[PDB]
Structures are given as structure tokens and as C-alpha cells.
Amino acid sequence: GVNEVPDYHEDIHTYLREMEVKCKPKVGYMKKQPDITNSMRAILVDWLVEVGEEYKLQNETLHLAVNYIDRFLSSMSVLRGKLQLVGTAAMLLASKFEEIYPPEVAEFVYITDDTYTKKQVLRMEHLVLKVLAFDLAAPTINQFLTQYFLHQQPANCKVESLAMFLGELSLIDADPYLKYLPSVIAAAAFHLALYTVTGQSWPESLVQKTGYTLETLKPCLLDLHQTYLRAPQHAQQSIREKYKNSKYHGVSLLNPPETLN
Amino acid sequence: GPGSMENFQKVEKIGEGTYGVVYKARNKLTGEVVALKKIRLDTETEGVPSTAIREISLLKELNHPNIVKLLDVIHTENKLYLVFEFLHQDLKKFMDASALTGIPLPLIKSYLFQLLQGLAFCHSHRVLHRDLKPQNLLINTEGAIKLADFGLARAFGVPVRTYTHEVVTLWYRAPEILLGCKYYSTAVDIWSLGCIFAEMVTRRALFPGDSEIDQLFRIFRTLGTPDEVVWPGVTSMPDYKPSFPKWARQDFSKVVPPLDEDGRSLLSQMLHYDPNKRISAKAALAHPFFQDVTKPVPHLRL
Ligand SMILES: CC(=O)Nc1ccc(Br)cc1
Ligand SMILES: CC(=O)Nc1ccc(Br)cc1
Numbered sequence A: 001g002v003n004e005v006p007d008y009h010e011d012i013h014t015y016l017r018e019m020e021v022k023c024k025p026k027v028g029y030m031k032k033q034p035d036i037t038n039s040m041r042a043i044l045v046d047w048l049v050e051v052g053e054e055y056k057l058q059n060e061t062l063h064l065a066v067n068y069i070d071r072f073l074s075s076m077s078v079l080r081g082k083l084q085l086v087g088t089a090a091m092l093l094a095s096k097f098e099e100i101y102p103p104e105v106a107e108f109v110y111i112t113d114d115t116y117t118k119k120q121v122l123r124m125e126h127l128v129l130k131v132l133a134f135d136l137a138a139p140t141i142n143q144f145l146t147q148y149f150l151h152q153q154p155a156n157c158k159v160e161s162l163a164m165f166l167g168e169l170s171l172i173d174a175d176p177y178l179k180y181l182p183s184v185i186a187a188a189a190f191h192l193a194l195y196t197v198t199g200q201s202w203p204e205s206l207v208q209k210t211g212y213t214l215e216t217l218k219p220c221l222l223d224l225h226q227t228y229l230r231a232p233q234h235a236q237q238s239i240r241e242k243y244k245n246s247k248y249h250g251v252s253l254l255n256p257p258e259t260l261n
Numbered sequence B: 001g002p003g004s005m006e007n008f009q010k011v012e013k014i015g016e017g018t019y020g021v022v023y024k025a026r027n028k029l030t031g032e033v034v035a036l037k038k039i040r041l042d043t044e045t046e047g048v049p050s051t052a053i054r055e056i057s058l059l060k061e062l063n064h065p066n067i068v069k070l071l072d073v074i075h076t077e078n079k080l081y082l083v084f085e086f087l088h089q090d091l092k093k094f095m096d097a098s099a100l101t102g103i104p105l106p107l108i109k110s111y112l113f114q115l116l117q118g119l120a121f122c123h124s125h126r127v128l129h130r131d132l133k134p135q136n137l138l139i140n141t142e143g144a145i146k147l148a149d150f151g152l153a154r155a156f157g158v159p160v161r162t163y164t165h166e167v168v169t170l171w172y173r174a175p176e177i178l179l180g181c182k183y184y185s186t187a188v189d190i191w192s193l194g195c196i197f198a199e200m201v202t203r204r205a206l207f208p209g210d211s212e213i214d215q216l217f218r219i220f221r222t223l224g225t226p227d228e229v230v231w232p233g234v235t236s237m238p239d240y241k242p243s244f245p246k247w248a249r250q251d252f253s254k255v256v257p258p259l260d261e262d263g264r265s266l267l268s269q270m271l272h273y274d275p276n277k278r279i280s281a282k283a284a285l286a287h288p289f290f291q292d293v294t295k296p297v298p299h300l301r302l
């Protein structure tokens, strides 16, 4: 059980719940962004999903990166021509923090198709560090999902992978997922995965851990359910493509439920 | 980032490292004595080093009397200065130069108890230290000891996933790492502390191996070669080999002879093979060995 830190999991959960609030982006930042839109971000995140796949980075890394991006765009106004540079620097920081073997700076320069220089990536990397004040150990959707998974009886890989996928889909669209905390989307994701695969619901035991019920998850779950329903039609497709892979049990090929009941 | 280098006066060099030099400095406005770690960015063709990113980010979050305080981070030209709470010595230098005839049981007990407090705070905030050793434990003039050097540190998730293998200075490295375990956890830090506990008693390293296999065997020769009974899984582990010599477990009272029954009990639980049975820092705080510690808790620092 030590891999599941029995002596510290509650402490850790409590602490992540407080830091998700601290590390939260501004809900309505994109309105105050003069030259960029929810759609441009979606394109950006979708691409980072691909970079993630191109260099076999952790899903955690993707999640951190997006947190860094949204927190940056929450206080820094950015021209469309520079949005990808922010994305690149973010992915570089998330890689250095989370990855055993981060890609070299020059690989980041390479995937931006030489839009930018090594110097630009490096200077941006610092700017982001400055804007975030090195505040990089951010709770992610994934950090909550993995703890919620410990409550499955029994464990189910299709459930795990499907919840991860739904979690990822949420990264794509700031409207409406910026309004929800990681811990809540994770919950929505877990319940929807669970229900799709097994027909079961959000367990009592996670009601005890989290304080959340289907009541409190309902808004988020309604959105996540729409997103899941429409995922084949969304302009951004890299997450669906990724989750056809056997590594994730091909869960993007499962059929969403027509109702949550 | 309230500070600038204009307000500091360098006093002397106190240390060196992979990414730079540490100085003892003085805040000319407040009087505060600090340790400045300079990280050079000019030389770096890979921008800010991953070591520094973790050290800074994880230390921001860890406010605890037994963890060395990061006061500030100054980002200048191609240079990064970490400003730290200053502590005059490390535990290794203390053991070497002043504990000639020994460290008094009161002080060992006090130090071990503070280390467990700080480590428990680390684990409680999902940080593994992953390089606990006496060189990385700082002592002040007031009796406080504090975990330091978070350059090898890592924010973990629950459950943990595969992290960097071959972490921890060898002498302090837990068996599960030496056996190429897929996963490791808070238990590796405990193992380190247990090595350290023994070392504070004897003032010599418990397992001074000169390779990963010599290290493994020195451990096996001391606690016996583990089998499925003492450690379920051990024989399935990636670098476990059936041909490993099978050493009898020597009586634990022979491992650290001067150690009392309470001491031996605690130590044995810190050095359990199976990381699942190894005591946590949190559980360890309530061990009888600490019944008679009264050294008052160090203050937080701001
Ligand atoms: C979509 C558009 O108008 N322009 C654009 C430019 C860069 C990114 Br990254 C995303 C979008
Ligand atoms: C060893 C010593 O003199 N003092 C000290 C204090 C803090 C750090 Br970080 C490194 C060294």
C-alpha cells in the first residue's frame, strides 16, 4: 500500500484541494484577451496533446502545461503570433518538472517549425517562471483521478482510461471548463467513465473523501456529458486520436450514454 | 521577490555544487544572515535547470521549522539567486569534528525526532526528498536540525508512478531502488533516515558500499538476505537474482550495539525490507524512543 501512501493520502488530498484554489486561472480571462479566443487556445492545447504524443510525455505533463498557460494568460495579454511561444515554454517547464527525461530545448524549437528561436523559447521560459513566481507544483485533474481510482471495486482499466480521456477533453475548451476546479472535473470524469463502462455511480466512499455528491457535480457532469457526446464533431481531434491507442485501451472508441439517468 | 543583490553583503564561501557556489551573506538593511545559492543561467544552453525548478517550486510550499526556509529568489541577468535561511553547519561536519567521543543520546533523539517532523511534513505535501544524508541536514546554534538540498526532490502523485531510478546517494539508498523496483514511495526517505539514525550513534555509515551490488550485499549481510516471507515480491523484482547469497539475519542488537531496546525497535522499523511494513515518519513520531525528548519545538521562520 506504500505506493498509495496510506499514511499521507488524506493529508495530500486536503492539500491538493487547497492548492487547486490557489493555482486556479481567472474564469473569464479570454474576454479580457484582445487578440486571442477560446478557439485559438483549443488549437494550442490540441497541438500540445500531439507534442505530448510525439515525444511520449506523461499525461501529467500535458495537464501541468495547460495550467501554466491558463495562469499566464490570466495576467499577460498575448498576440496570436505569440500564443504558441507561451505554449512551447509552458510544455518545456512542465517537462522539466514532471518528466524523467525531458526533451531538450532544441526539440521544443523544432516542433514549432522554427516559428521561434531557441533564445525566444528560453526568454519566454523565464517570463513564465516570473509570472507564475515558480509556482509550478499545481494540482491537476490527473492528480485527483488517480486517487479516485483507488475507490473502484474492482479496478477497471477501461474506467481508468476513459476517465483520463474525458479529463483531457476538458482541457481543450476554456468555456466551460475554466469555471470548474480540477477536483470537480476529475469527479465528473470519474463518474461518467464509471457509469458508461459499468453502469455504476459516484461511490459513497468518494462522497466521504471529497464532500462532493452527484448533486454538487451535476453542472460539470452535464457539460462533460455534452462534450463527450459531441467529441466526434469537435474541430479538435488529437485527444480522440490519441485514445484509440491500445495504451489507453482504445477508450475513445466506446459509445457515450445517451442519458446520465 | 522583495529583494535585490544591492541589499546583501557577501561574507564568505560556504559551499559549492553542480550549478554553483553558496555564500554566507548578510542583509544590510535587516541584519539577517542568509545563505545565497547562485545558479548560473548564462552558461546554461538548456535554460533554467530542472534541479532548480523543482527546488524552488517545492520549497515555496514547504514552510516547516525542520525544513530550511527559502526566503526569496532573485532573477537577475543570466543569474538566479536562491536566498535561504542560514544554518552554520551540517550533520556530517558535526559528527566529524565535534562528536569525537560520541553524540549524546538526548541530542540524537532530538535530532531524529526533528528530522521525522520535517520529513512527515514533506510526505504530507506530496514531496519525496530522495537524498537524505548527513551532508544535507543543517544544524543551527540553538539545537534545530533541518532538511536541506531539495535538488533531487520530486512532487509525487497518489499512487506514485515510475520516477528516476538510481536516486539517493548510494550509502543511504533503499533496497527497492537497488533492486530496480518499478515504483518507490515515501519509504525510501525513511530508509535514508534509518541509515542516518545508525550513523549518528556510531558516527560511521551503516552500509558503505562501493557499487550497487556491494551495497545490496552489505545490506543483506546485516539484515539477512530477504525472501518472500519477509518481503512479498522481492524475488520478482527486476534486478533480483536467484543466485544472491542467502545470508542469515544477524540479531539486531549486534547491528548498533550501544543502542537501547527502544532505539533498536525504532531502527528495525525504519530498516524493514518490505516498504509496505517500513514505518512512516508520521507513525514514528509516536515511538517510545522519543518519550523523553523535551527540546522545545523550533520556531517557523518568516
Ligand atoms: C486560429 C487563428 O486565427 N490563428 C491562430 C494562430 C496561432 C494559434 Br496557436 C492558433 C490560432
Ligand atoms: C553548510 C553551511 O555552512 N550552511 C548552509 C546553509 C544553507 C545551505 Br542551502 C547550504 C549551506
Ligand SMILES: CC(=O)Nc1ccc(Br)cc1
Pocket (backbone or CB within 6 Å): B211, B213, B241, B243, B244
Ligand atoms: C552486477 C555486478 O557488478 N556484480 C554482481 C555480482 C554478483 C551478482 Br549475483 C550480480 C552482480
